[PDB]
Design a protein around this nucleic acid. Structure first.
Ligand SMILES: [Mg+2]
Ligand SMILES: [Mg+2]
Ligand SMILES: [Mg+2]
Ligand SMILES: [Mg+2]
Ligand SMILES: [Mg+2]
Ligand SMILES: [Mg+2]
Ligand SMILES: [Mg+2]
Ligand SMILES: [Mg+2]
Ligand SMILES: [Mg+2]
Ligand SMILES: [Mg+2]
Ligand SMILES: [Mg+2]
Ligand SMILES: [Mg+2]
Ligand SMILES: [Mg+2]
Ligand SMILES: [Mg+2]
Ligand SMILES: [Mg+2]
Ligand SMILES: [Mg+2]
Ligand SMILES: [Mg+2]
Ligand SMILES: [Mg+2]
Ligand SMILES: [Mg+2]
Ligand SMILES: [Mg+2]
Ligand SMILES: [Mg+2]
Ligand SMILES: [Mg+2]
Ligand SMILES: [Mg+2]
Ligand SMILES: [Mg+2]
Ligand SMILES: [Mg+2]
Ligand SMILES: [Mg+2]
Ligand SMILES: [Mg+2]
Ligand SMILES: [Mg+2]
Ligand SMILES: [Mg+2]
Ligand SMILES: [Mg+2]
Ligand SMILES: [Mg+2]
Ligand SMILES: [Mg+2]
Ligand SMILES: [Mg+2]
Ligand SMILES: [Mg+2]
Ligand SMILES: [Mg+2]
Ligand SMILES: [Mg+2]
Ligand SMILES: [Mg+2]
Ligand SMILES: [Mg+2]
Ligand SMILES: [Mg+2]
Ligand SMILES: [Mg+2]
Ligand SMILES: [Mg+2]
Ligand SMILES: [Mg+2]
Ligand SMILES: [Mg+2]
Ligand SMILES: [Mg+2]
Ligand SMILES: [Mg+2]
Ligand SMILES: [Mg+2]
Ligand SMILES: [Mg+2]
Ligand SMILES: [Mg+2]
Ligand SMILES: [Mg+2]
Ligand SMILES: [Mg+2]
Ligand SMILES: [Mg+2]
Ligand SMILES: [Mg+2]
Ligand SMILES: [Mg+2]
Ligand SMILES: [Mg+2]
Ligand SMILES: [Mg+2]
Ligand SMILES: [Mg+2]
Ligand SMILES: [Mg+2]
Ligand SMILES: [Mg+2]
Ligand SMILES: [Mg+2]
Ligand SMILES: [Mg+2]
Ligand SMILES: [Mg+2]
Ligand SMILES: [Mg+2]
Ligand SMILES: [Mg+2]
Ligand SMILES: [Mg+2]
Ligand SMILES: [Mg+2]
Ligand SMILES: [Mg+2]
Ligand SMILES: [Mg+2]
Ligand SMILES: [Mg+2]
Ligand SMILES: [Mg+2]
Ligand SMILES: [Mg+2]
Ligand SMILES: [Mg+2]
Ligand SMILES: [Mg+2]
Ligand SMILES: [Mg+2]
Ligand SMILES: [Mg+2]
Ligand SMILES: [Mg+2]
Ligand SMILES: [Mg+2]
Ligand SMILES: [Mg+2]
Ligand SMILES: [Mg+2]
Ligand SMILES: [Mg+2]
Ligand SMILES: [Mg+2]
Ligand SMILES: [Mg+2]
Ligand SMILES: [Mg+2]
Ligand SMILES: [Mg+2]
Ligand SMILES: [Zn+2]
Lengths: 99, 124, 99, 83, 208, 138
RNA sequence: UUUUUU
RNA sequence: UGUGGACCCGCCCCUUGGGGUGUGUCCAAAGGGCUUUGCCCGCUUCCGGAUGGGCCCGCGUCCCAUCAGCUAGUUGGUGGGGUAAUGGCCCACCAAGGCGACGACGGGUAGCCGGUCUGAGAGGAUGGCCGGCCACAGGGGCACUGAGACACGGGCCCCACUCCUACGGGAGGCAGCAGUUAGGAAUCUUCCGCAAUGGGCGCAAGCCUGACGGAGCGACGCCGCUUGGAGGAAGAAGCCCUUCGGGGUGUAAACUCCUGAACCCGGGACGAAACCCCCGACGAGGGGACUGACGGUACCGGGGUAAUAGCGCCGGCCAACUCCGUGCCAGCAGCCGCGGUAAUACGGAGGGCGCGAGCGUUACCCGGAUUCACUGGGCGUAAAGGGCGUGUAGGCGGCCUGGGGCGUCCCAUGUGAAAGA
């Protein structure tokens, strides 16, 4: 009895919280950004879409989103922001997106 | 039948039914005796043939034949069933191995000792 | 090579999708006569181009949905309902031979 | 990682190895990529080792890793001899 | 282990002289002399016409019993002959004639077949300088079948090679009598053997 | 309607030769004509020629037979001893070049229909082509 | 009546 | 910090999400070790190779029609969610579709193949061992961690069982190697070893390895080998038959001579060369050193004893016959059949035939069986023409020319792993 492969299980729950935390940040910021895009604030939605992107590409640096999984959310975000930003557009910050 | 017929229906392989329902298709099956009897054969012959009702490890109750000039098998004795039919006795589909648990080999058997299960004597 | 087939459209009733019936000739593996089997394929028609009775070339594609792994390449021969009427009549015969 | 190693094809007390390219994860006698030579340890025949070096030289370019015993035999057929 | 027992009783059952006894099959004691009828109580009774299988069976035994081989090695040798290229009939004989124990007798090193077997089995026979103690060893053309110098001083060996003086050997064999050497030149042909056995009969025995 | 004109022609000859007809007619067809050409080349028939009967074209097949024989049944030995249609409708027979049989250990022929034409079994093998196996003739 | 047609 | 990559948008070339480019935004990292000024083990981003894999497609893949109708995420669409990635994989909404006699749906059975057995072949049967793929880890469900799992010896939960229990609650999971028990006709040692090969970790030394290599037991299979060789009476004893003359066991034995299975004595392995150390630059190359389970086994040399034979059958198929015993009894029997007073068929003996460390038996598979007939069958009377018609589907198609080249035929090539054959 008493194999020390339980050491792996103990680490598994460490990484569990880590991955879980970063994801809940990604989601909460993305929904906050797309809220503003739908609500027409062009600067604030952009200032947030940047941090969402930065948080995404940071999550991929580790073992959370490592694959193109990061790219999907980055892709989906910038589209829905730019789309929702088409209601009296005026892309004020213009930082995150391309001309 | 036409070629087209064969394409439509095709031949039917002939299924061969087993002659020995000793289940698990086993080479042998052991069982306990129910009755030890003596039965009369079919038309051309006449004799007293010693047989036995056997409750089988296959969950079967069948009749088995007792080979040899004489037997020690009793009502409760346990035996091993061989298989193969007694022609002139209807319904007896299986034989009995002599030289197995409670069925001794035939005494004074000097010719065919592989069958009937008897050992090799000594010559002084 | 992507597998390519040639068959006749027997169904118009779906959206962006046509059912293509591809016959096949091959000798019987034992009895040696030439037998004619056939199999229906669900083809993708994005532009709703092809109609009932059209004979089209179908090509193995990246799956569009369940049961839809083929796209319509080009129209071979247009409008021969005799091939469709052959299929309908056989399908219509199954209302008999039930009870 | 793809490796170069031996595979036992001889019999009991008569071993015969097949120098072989295979993924390290497959069985030592299991499926392999390419047979690149044989090894008779008991040296029962005049030719008890053959390599086809230029093939073995290919797999070392694409990152195969030989065993200590495989590298020992490859050196004996001069895979690494560079003169 | 092969058949071991009365031999010149099998000279009788085949109806043909079987020189498995070595000498005394030549002297008028073989029991083929003044007793050609088969052994047993009914040997002197008139024999019934043999069935078509009876003839084929007896012909195989007449050949098998001559080389002194069990049916096991015998049958395998046949199944080997049928696959190889050539006439199944003659090839099978050449394979029997390639048996080391049979070559030893054929070379006159031993008086009989059984005797030549024991000489091999005890290591007295040399094949190309090495000892070979297996009677079933097949000799290839060109191999030297010699006598171990350990045994060259044995009186049994100097006995048989004394009568071999001036004696001729088969056209597919040759022997040096003094140095106790010997050589297997080639596979014998059907004509090279005088064996009183119809080979087509033995083939026909195995088609069943 | 006639079902298989070839088997019909193969039979028209089979039937005529059993009563030792001098000649027999078969409805004219180019494919049939190529069959008759192989038979006239391979010496199974005296030959053939086109002819019309009641205006419709036909093919006179002149049969040949052996010598009038000895005691009872003086009828001669047949030149065509056997003819059998192989690849019939409803069950077609196509053989590659390696699948072409040896008819009667060489003494007979196998009329093959090939992309390179109607050939005997030997002609088809030296041409190195297979095809539809028409019939045995020996 | 049952086996055996010699 | 931006080599570069990721993302929105535009442009270019390709053509499904492939490659490039522009602007903008976002994204990098870790040290350790010494022979410590340089090198080794590592770290980060990107591109490519190699290997391994996911998903999708054509085709092939057992029986029952006494299963004939099946289907609601079911069929498709748009948009979204999720994934490494397509997809009703999931979700919302829209359309009403999708499948079936070319066997749907249901039921039964079963891992599949390379191969194996059989067979003249076509074919039939089978899938143990070994190799490839798949599925499962007490039953069911679920995710976490990760390049990779929904994970045999990881986690959570429900259920059945076993153990601990202070009755509150816990611990488990041999279809890993042995080993026990149960069932069963039946299936092994709780063995040796890290020496070889292979795998995991490490700079290395080394550590781990019931993978593996070996031993053990079992005639379970295959193969090789012994139980003697030669001389030996027109022929002992005993047993068996007898026309009472004699015949048989039979050169067989006794006995003469030679060899020398076992066993004793000594020598005594190959499987093992690298990793490492040293020179050379930790490269090539060269040089050197340690390293056995099997096992003192294999093998060689010396010594050396005549030294296990069994089982089946002998009425025909089918090879081998007489006597006595028994009298439709006791019994034989694969089939046809033997025995009811002379039985070559029962039972024993003598003798004979067949194999021989095996011989028989039962079960199972193929064979003979052309007895499911593609090769290769039939239906007047032997088993078999539907009571007759109409006609649907399907199958089948007269003569001439021409296009196409799907079937068909030919060449080249790729593939057809290894083992087997
Ligand atoms: Mg750890
Ligand atoms: Mg939240
Ligand atoms: Mg993950
Ligand atoms: Mg049926
Ligand atoms: Mg009772
Ligand atoms: Mg006995
Ligand atoms: Mg439509
Ligand atoms: Mg879709
Ligand atoms: Mg297209
Ligand atoms: Mg309906
Ligand atoms: Mg793998
Ligand atoms: Mg190199
Ligand atoms: Mg140089
Ligand atoms: Mg140089
Ligand atoms: Mg053969
Ligand atoms: Mg050949
Ligand atoms: Mg041959
Ligand atoms: Mg031959
Ligand atoms: Mg010669
Ligand atoms: Mg045969
Ligand atoms: Mg740049
Ligand atoms: Mg830029
Ligand atoms: Mg830091
Ligand atoms: Mg880090
Ligand atoms: Mg690649
Ligand atoms: Mg299917
Ligand atoms: Mg819905
Ligand atoms: Mg979608
Ligand atoms: Mg809509
Ligand atoms: Mg179909
Ligand atoms: Mg199952
Ligand atoms: Mg075979
Ligand atoms: Mg099959
Ligand atoms: Mg199968
Ligand atoms: Mg398996
Ligand atoms: Mg499960
Ligand atoms: Mg269990
Ligand atoms: Mg489970
Ligand atoms: Mg990992
Ligand atoms: Mg799993
Ligand atoms: Mg376990
Ligand atoms: Mg335990
Ligand atoms: Mg038990
Ligand atoms: Mg074992
Ligand atoms: Mg390493
Ligand atoms: Mg351990
Ligand atoms: Mg092992
Ligand atoms: Mg006497
Ligand atoms: Mg003797
Ligand atoms: Mg001695
Ligand atoms: Mg060694
Ligand atoms: Mg060495
Ligand atoms: Mg070491
Ligand atoms: Mg140095
Ligand atoms: Mg070196
Ligand atoms: Mg030792
Ligand atoms: Mg010795
Ligand atoms: Mg003795
Ligand atoms: Mg027999
Ligand atoms: Mg007989
Ligand atoms: Mg008997
Ligand atoms: Mg009496
Ligand atoms: Mg009588
Ligand atoms: Mg009597
Ligand atoms: Mg008797
Ligand atoms: Mg008897
Ligand atoms: Mg006897
Ligand atoms: Mg043996
Ligand atoms: Mg059979
Ligand atoms: Mg058959
Ligand atoms: Mg046959
Ligand atoms: Mg039948
Ligand atoms: Mg037929
Ligand atoms: Mg045919
Ligand atoms: Mg019939
Ligand atoms: Mg009738
Ligand atoms: Mg009628
Ligand atoms: Mg009727
Ligand atoms: Mg036509
Ligand atoms: Mg048509
Ligand atoms: Mg073509
Ligand atoms: Mg191969
Ligand atoms: Mg090979
Ligand atoms: Zn003799």
């Amino acid at each position: 009895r008493n194999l020390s492969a339980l050491k792996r299980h103990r680490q598994s729950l460490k990484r569990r919280l880590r991955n879980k935390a970063k994801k809940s940040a990604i989601k909460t910021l993305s929904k906050k950004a797309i809220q503003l895009a739908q609500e027409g604030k062009a600067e604030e939605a952009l200032k947030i879409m940047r941090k969402a992107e930065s948080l995404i590409d940071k999550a991929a640096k580790g073992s959370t989103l490592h694959k193109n999984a990061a790219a999907r959310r980055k892709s989906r975000l910038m589209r829905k922001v730019r789309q929702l930003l088409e209601a009296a557009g005026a892309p004020l910050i213009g930082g995150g997106l391309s001309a | 039948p036409t070629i087209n017929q064969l394409v439509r229906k095709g031949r039917e392989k002939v299924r061969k039914k087993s002659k020995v329902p000793a289940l698990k298709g086993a080479p042998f099956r052991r069982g306990v005796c129910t009755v030890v009897r003596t039965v009369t054969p079919k038309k051309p012959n006449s004799a007293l043939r010693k047989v036995a009702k056997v409750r089988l490890t296959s969950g079967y109750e069948v009749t088995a034949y007792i080979p040899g000039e004489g037997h020690n098998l009793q009502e409760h004795s346990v035996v091993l069933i061989r298989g193969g039919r007694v022609k002139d006795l209807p319904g007896v589909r299986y034989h009995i191995v002599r030289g197995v648990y409670d069925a001794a080999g035939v005494k004074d058997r000097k010719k065919s000792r592989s069958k009937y299960g008897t050992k090799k004597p000594k010559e002084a | 090579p992507k597998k390519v087939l040639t068959g006749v459209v027997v169904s118009d009733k779906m959206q962006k999708t046509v059912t293509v019936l591809v016959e096949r000739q091959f000798p019987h593996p034992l009895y040696g006569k030439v037998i004619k089997r056939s199999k229906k394929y669900l083809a993708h028609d994005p532009e709703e181009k092809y109609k009932l009775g059209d004979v089209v070339e179908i090509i193995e594609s990246r799956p569009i949905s369940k049961r839809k792994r083929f796209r319509v390449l080009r129209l071979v021969e247009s409008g021969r309902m005799d091939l469709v009427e052959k299929y309908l009549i056989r399908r219509q015969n199954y209302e008999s031979l039930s009870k | 990682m793809v490796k170069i190693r031996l595979a036992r094809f001889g019999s009991k007390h008569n071993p015969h190895y097949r120098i072989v390219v295979t993924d390290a994860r497959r069985k030592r006698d299991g499926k392999y990529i390419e047979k690149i030579g044989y090894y008779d340890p008991r040296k029962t025949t005049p030719d008890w080792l053959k390599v086809d070096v230029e093939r073995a030289r290919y797999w070392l370019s694409v990152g195969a890793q030989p065993t200590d015993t495989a590298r020992r035999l490859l050196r004996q057929a001069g895979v690494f001899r560079q003169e | 282990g092969r058949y071991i027992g009365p031999v010149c009783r099998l000279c009788r059952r085949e109806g043909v002289k079987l020189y498995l006894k070595g000498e005394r099959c030549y002297s008028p004691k073989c029991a083929m002399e003044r007793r050609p009828y088969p052994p047993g109580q009914h040997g002197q009774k008139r024999a019934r016409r043999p069935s078509d299988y009876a003839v084929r069976l007896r012909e195989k035994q007449k050949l098998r019993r001559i080389y002194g081989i069990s049916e096991r090695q015998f049958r395998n040798l046949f199944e080997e002959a049928s696959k190889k290229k050539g006439v199944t009939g003659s090839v099978f004989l050449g394979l029997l004639e390639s048996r080391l124990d049979n070559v030893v007798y054929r070379l006159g090193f031993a008086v009989s077949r059984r005797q030549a077997r024991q000489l091999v089995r005890h290591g007295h026979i040399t094949v190309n300088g090495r000892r070979v103690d297996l009677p079933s060893y097949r000799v290839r053309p060109g191999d030297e079948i010699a006598v171990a110098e350990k045994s060259r001083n044995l009186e049994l060996i100097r006995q048989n090679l004394e009568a071999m003086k001036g004696r001729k050997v088969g056209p597919w064999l040759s022997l040096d009598v003094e140095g106790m050497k010997g050589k297997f030149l080639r596979l014998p042909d059907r004509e090279d053997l005088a064996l009183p056995v119809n080979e087509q009969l033995v083939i026909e025995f195995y088609s069943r | 309607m006639l079902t298989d004109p070839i088997a019909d022609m193969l039979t028209r000859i089979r039937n005529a030769t059993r009563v030792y007809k001098e000649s027999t007619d078969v409805p004219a067809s180019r494919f049939k004509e190529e069959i008759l050409r192989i038979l006239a080349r391979e010496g199974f028939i005296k030959g053939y020629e086109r002819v019309d009967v009641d205006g419709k074209p036909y093919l006179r097949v002149y049969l040949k037979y052996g010598p009038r024989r000895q005691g009872p049944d003086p009828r001669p030995e047949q030149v065509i001893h056997h003819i059998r249609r192989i690849s019939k409708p409803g069950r077609r027979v196509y053989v590659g070049v390696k699948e072409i049989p040896r008819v009667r250990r060489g003494l007979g022929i196998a009329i093959l229909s090939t992309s390179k034409g109607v050939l005997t079994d030997r002609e088809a093998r030296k041409l190195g082509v297979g095809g539809e196996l028409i019939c045995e003739v020996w």
